[PDB]
Symmetry: D2
Subunit: 115 residues, 4 copies
């Protein structure tokens, strides 16, 4: 599982469940092509986005739909999404975990990259 996303809620002190996550890859024409998408489970994790075969080198964007998350909880948030854009696999295949921490007016993300 070369790409995993974990999302926590800093208001409620809980995993963020049912958060939609969209991954794009920069194409040769310099536009964002759809790559993979999914939704977080009860523990706030999203596994199975991609495979070692599909996850080639490239510039990837992970868009976490934090807006819909907050709105479903009845809160009107600031940001449209939480994100990372990063170059992947440039020095060979890595495993990437994108960890996001959410509040209505703030987010942070971290990458954990292992070999």
């Amino acid at each position: 599982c070369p790409l995993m996303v974990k999302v926590l809620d800093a208001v409620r002190g809980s995993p963020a469940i049912n958060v939609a996550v969209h991954v794009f890859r920069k194409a040769a024409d310099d536009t964002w092509e759809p790559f993979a998408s999914g939704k977080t489970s009860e523990p706030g994790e999203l596994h199975g986005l991609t495979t070692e075969e599909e996850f080639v080198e490239g510039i990837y964007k992970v868009e976490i739909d934090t807006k819909s998350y907050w709105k479903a909880l009845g809160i009107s948030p600031f940001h449209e999404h939480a994100e990372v854009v990063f170059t992947a696999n440039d020095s060979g295949p890595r495993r990437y975990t994108i960890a996001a921490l959410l509040s209505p007016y703030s987010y942070s993300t971290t990458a954990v990259v292992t070999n």
Copy 2:
């Protein structure tokens, strides 16, 4: 002014100076149209991006060129940039604050009357 960006560096414990920042507004075709840009000053701040007349409601993206910042310091970065996307909806001033590390960033909004 109605929009200010502030950038701090969590590695060096300092303001992030000479960071390039671009702001875009979402147009009707769902593309991003350049709106304003500049480079942070010694206190890590970027003032004078826009004006009350120009800064209308809509969806904005603040792109902070973090990769160039880290490369200039000789520190290996993860992210291409940081992209901070928000909707602007009485009298208001917005500050977009970012705290930078090589493999992480954090951003908050400070919206005041």
Copy 3:
């Protein structure tokens, strides 16, 4: 001044106003001795805590009363407080910045010449 504290609220997207802050310096018995305190102002800042003469090298704790802040807003908090502990070691100014959520906080130091 040599030590400033700045507090932001990640829930409301605002400066954290009227937050109590206490600073302590570690004495030889490894106890904490009150050094300075105050409450944040409208921009979420606390200036005038100490003086150049008073602020010597040593180990300091900045305790931010986050639980009282969240209770005053009617928002359920996790932490008792936030305790920010650091060593103070040429010409320097320190800013201790904190970003608050009910179940999380983040803190950074901005150390400038």
Copy 4:
């Protein structure tokens, strides 16, 4: 496992390994009594600090020795530790994960509390 600690390194993009963690509990005399301690493993986690029997209500302090961590990596950091102080189990037993993200001049922590 009622209390778990997870520590990530925001500079290297990795779990923070071999980080010492000390937990204290406020005693009836209002001093901090030692409660439990341990060190993070390869994935940056510390399990087995305590048990359901031992982890009673109380005010707890978790001190993560971030200073020794950075110094072992040859870096001189700002903070002595990363921490939380919190009241635990006041509305009955909960499971607590304390998630910490470290940089040389900054840290953040989050609590994940489940029933």
